[PDB]
């Protein structure tokens, strides 16, 4: 109860004393200040004073960074963010989760940087899709740098899907081309075909039938594409759009190949009409 708020202040006081400096001790005691800020934070949190818990975690982060302790600074920034989420102020957490990720790569633990960015992306989805797409791209860049290519592609996938949901189809197209190259490099051909489905859905949605047909043409040189169901289905779709056959276009857009796509593409297929 009130016991805990009392303790939190005692801890901030001790923190401040540790940072105080003297001719006999001429460098603040950053390590001990950090411990105390951590303890203030935990106390405020238990007392349900979330905003105060968050400010204490920021002090702890500062203290750790000042003590060259990058992993622990990062951990503390993440805790401040999670206080902000818990307060229904997730937008305000972003800056701190980003600061943490910089500290995580600086430290030689880039996986952790990419997961903090992924995690934040997902929590930003209900709030601002653009920023969510941005975090996911940031996560992908990190994964790419430490050469984790499955991981980076997966994240670009998330951004592709959300750009479709946002109806930024130009961007969605660029994102899907990038995905497709990555899976092509990794030689994951079955997944390339699916990207081609999505690429065509997007282009038909822009009513850019030429671009749509170009994706299919380009994909013929991806091994195993010409003889796949995926390609058969896209050829039927294009044919139907070209001949303006509504029955066929609706049928294809509602076949399992297409409706089992990720939700954002399946929907985009649902809404497609003959020109």
How far CA 211 is from CA of 37, 45, 71, 196, 216, in Å, comes to 57, 55, 47, 12, 9
* Cβ atoms 4, 52 nearer than 8 A: no
Rounded distance between C-alpha atoms, residue 115 and residue 6, angstroms:
36
- The CATH number of the structural domain formed by 1-275 is 1.25.40.10
Q: Are 100 and 116 in contact (CB under 8 A)?
A: yes
- Resolution of the determined structure in angstroms stands at 2.6
Q: What approach was used to elucidate this structure?
A: X-ray
Confirm if 264 and 164 have CB atoms less than 8 A apart. Answer: yes
- How many Å apart are CA 83 and CA 54, to the nearest integer? 6
CA 5 to chain centre: 36
Going 56 to 77 to 135 to 83, the CA torsion angle's sign is: negative
Taken in order 230, 246, 271, 175, the sign of the CA dihedral is positive
Please state the domain extents for the chain.
1-275
């Amino acid at each position: 109860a009130a016991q805990k708020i009392s303790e939190a202040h005692e801890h901030i006081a001790k923190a401040e004393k540790y940072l105080k400096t003297s001719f006999m001790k001429w460098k603040p005691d950053y390590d001990s200040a950090a411990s105390e800020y951590a303890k203030a934070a935990v106390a405020f949190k238990n007392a349900k004073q979330l905003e105060q818990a968050k400010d204490a975690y920021l002090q702890e982060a500062e203290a750790h960074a000042n003590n060259r302790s990058l992993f622990h600074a990062a951990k503390a920034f993440e805790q401040a963010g999670m206080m902000l989420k818990d307060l229904q102020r997730m937008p305000e957490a972003v800056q701190y989760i980003e600061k943490a990720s910089v500290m995580y790569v600086e430290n030689g633990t880039p996986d952790t940087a990419a997961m903090a960015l992924d995690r934040a992306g997902k929590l930003m989805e209900p709030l601002d899709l653009s920023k969510a797409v941005h975090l996911y791209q940031q996560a992908a860049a990190v994964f790419e740098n430490e050469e984790r290519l499955r991981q980076a592609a997966e994240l670009i996938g998330k951004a592709s899907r959300l750009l479709v949901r946002q109806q930024k189809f130009d961007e969605a197209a660029a994102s899907l081309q990038k995905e497709k190259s990555m899976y092509k490099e990794m030689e994951n051909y079955p997944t390339c075909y699916k990207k081609c489905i999505a690429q065509v859905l997007v282009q038909l949605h822009r009513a850019d039938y030429v671009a749509a047909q170009k994706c299919v043409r380009e994909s013929y040189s991806i091994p195993g594409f010409s003889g796949s169901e995926d390609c058969a289905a896209l050829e039927d779709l294009l044919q139907a759009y070209d001949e303006q056959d509504e029955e066929q276009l609706l049928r294809v857009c509602r076949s399992p190949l297409v409706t089992y796509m990720d939700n954002d593409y399946a929907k985009l297929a649902i809404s497609l009409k003959v020109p």
